[PDB]
Amino acid sequence: KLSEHLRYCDSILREMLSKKHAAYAWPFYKPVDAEALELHDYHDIIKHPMDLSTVKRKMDGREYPDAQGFAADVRLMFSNCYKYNPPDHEVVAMARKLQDVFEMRFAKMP
Amino acid sequence: APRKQLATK
Ligand SMILES: [Cl-]
Incomplete structure (x- = not known):
């Protein structure tokens, strides 16, 4: 079912x-x-709360209306880490390097 | 205050 944009998101998720x-x-x-x-x-x-397994679950179950819905969850995950x-903390440094990967991939989405 | 510990067990 996935749209072309939501396929690119699943590609990013697969890389993360x-x-x-x-x-x-x-x-x-x-x-x-x-x-x-x-x-x-x-x-x-x-x-x-939000994590990559949950994002994969919703992606596999086609629960995302658009790419903006996907990015919102991925950023919610990082936001929770920064907030708590x-x-x-090293886990914050980890979140930042992983978010660098995400934002870079997401921005170059055709 | 609780701090999450990534260190292995
Ligand atoms: Cl691999």
Whole structure:
């Protein structure tokens, strides 16, 4: 069903999940486990959690109306990371390098 | 205040 633009998005998503960016992309593979990491305030601070597996799920299930809907979730993921964690945290540095990859790919979408 | 720890277990 996917439109040409939403195919390009699935291409970007496929790249963000590859071994090429694993060094800084792995904390975003699955939802943030507030249990395991013992983050008792994560869901009180992050109202709308988001990760790459969820984005893949919605992409496979064709839940995105357009490319803008895709980008919104991907940025929501990064926004939550910036919002919850201190500015000096390594996971923030990881998010920034991965977002560099995303924004660069997304901007060059035909 | 809770801080997420990426360090392996
Ligand atoms: Cl690969």
